[PDB]
Amino acid sequence: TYDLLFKLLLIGDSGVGKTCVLFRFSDDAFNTTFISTIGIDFKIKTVELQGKKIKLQIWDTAGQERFHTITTSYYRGAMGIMLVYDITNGKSFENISKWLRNIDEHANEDVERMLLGNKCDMDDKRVVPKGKGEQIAREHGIRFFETSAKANINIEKAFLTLAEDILRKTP
Amino acid sequence: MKEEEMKRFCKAQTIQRRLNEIEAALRELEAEGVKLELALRRQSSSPEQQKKLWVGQLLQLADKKNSLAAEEAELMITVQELNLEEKQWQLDQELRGYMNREENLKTAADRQAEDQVLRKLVDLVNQRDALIRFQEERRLSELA
Ligand SMILES: Nc1nc2c(ncn2[C@@H]2O[C@H](COP(=O)(O)OP(=O)(O)NP(=O)(O)O)[C@@H](O)[C@H]2O)c(=O)[nH]1
Ligand SMILES: [Mg+2]
């Protein structure tokens, strides 16, 4: 039914859009009502890359601080991690440094890391210039995309790119 | 959502209907195979052309049984997925009830109960993960 199982993980502050980003990828749908994630969840999406059927198990974490210890239990199994901030929320981007340290402490040493600046449809409420995301990604050697779950901008591209980078080192 | 509760129930009913269809089909195929296996043994008098036909029909019964059995196996996992997803949804809703109450109104027993529901909810996600891991172990085994 599939060739390979990849484990992905989404982390970042509460409200930045981790759950909507996943829902747009898994369902091609967007919902405006904020339902905060409680503890941990995951969804399954199977994709085809280079003739292989890749089952993605995508773990979605609670960004609320209360759930931090629950969420850190799930870093170590991840093969790729999306760090998500909100381009309209300056604090969400300042905390990316902290989320990177969490990956340093709890994830596997060779996990793939990808930075997502979400809500890129809110140009007129932007606080984080795209160049700051590009710069911190350059400083860590990681990929970076500005995304929008609402407008469906770079959602498929982000997830499929991360999956290709995992697949590229699979044998 | 609440949409998702209904869609989960309907999908579970649909799979149960198909599982019932497969159970009936497998027992009919089994009876047919027994009948043709008996004809091959009893009727060695019979021409090779007729016995070649029975051998061919036995081979295609075998192919259909394997296909039905593979479909049944995948649906049985989906049944349990939907059961776990429904249980997680129930715990999610119960915990949001506790969470939406002002902290000033919570007794010590309320806070203990909320913690317990959160522990159960995380465990349900871990049960769903264990099912994913079961499928990956069967994938590895079926491959070899
Ligand atoms: N304009 C806009 N709003 C978005 C976008 N993505 C999410 N939102 C909105 O932002 C809010 C929070 O989204 P959500 O996915 O729940 O964020 P989260 O990171 O999962 N929060 P948590 O960590 O608490 O579970 C919701 O109101 C949602 O509609 C986007 O691309 N554009
Ligand atoms: Mg969420």
CA dist., res. B36 & res. B55, Å (int): 8
CA dist., res. B144 & res. B138, Å (int): 10
Strand order in the sheet with A143-146: A40-49, A52-61, A4-11, A80-86, A112-118, A143-146
CA dist., res. A18 & res. A12, Å (int): 7
Amino acid of residue A144: F
User: Which tokens hold the place of B23?
Assistant: 């159970």
CA dist., res. B97 & res. A144, Å (int): 38
**CA closest to A54 among chain B residues:** B136
Contact A145, A156 (CB under 8 A): no
Contact A126, A87 (CB under 8 A): yes
Method: X-ray
User: Which tokens hold the place of B55?
Assistant: 């051998």
Nearest residue (CA) to ligand 1, atom 22: A14
Strand pairing class (A52-61; A40-49)? antiparallel
**CA closest to A5 among chain B residues:** B136
Strand pairing class (A4-11; A80-86)? parallel
HSE value, Cβ hemisphere, 13 Å, CA-based, for B92: 18
Contact A39, A17 (CB under 8 A): no
Contact A13, B97 (CB under 8 A): no
Beta strands of chain A (E only): which ranges? 4-11, 40-49, 52-61, 80-86, 112-118, 143-146
Query: Is there an atom of ligand 1 within 6 Å of A39 CB?
Result: no
CA dist., res. B78 & res. B76, Å (int): 5
Contact B26, B69 (CB under 8 A): yes
Count of Cβ atoms closer than 10 Å to residue A102 Cβ: 16
The CATH code of domain A2-171 reads: 3.40.50.300
Owner of token pair 């003739």: A51
Count of Cβ atoms closer than 10 Å to residue B45 Cβ: 6
3-class state of residue A63 by DSSP:
coil
Q: Return the bridge partners of A8, or none.
A: A58, A80
Please indicate if the annotation marks A152 as binding a ligand: no
Query: Is there an atom of ligand 1 within 6 Å of A89 CB?
Result: no
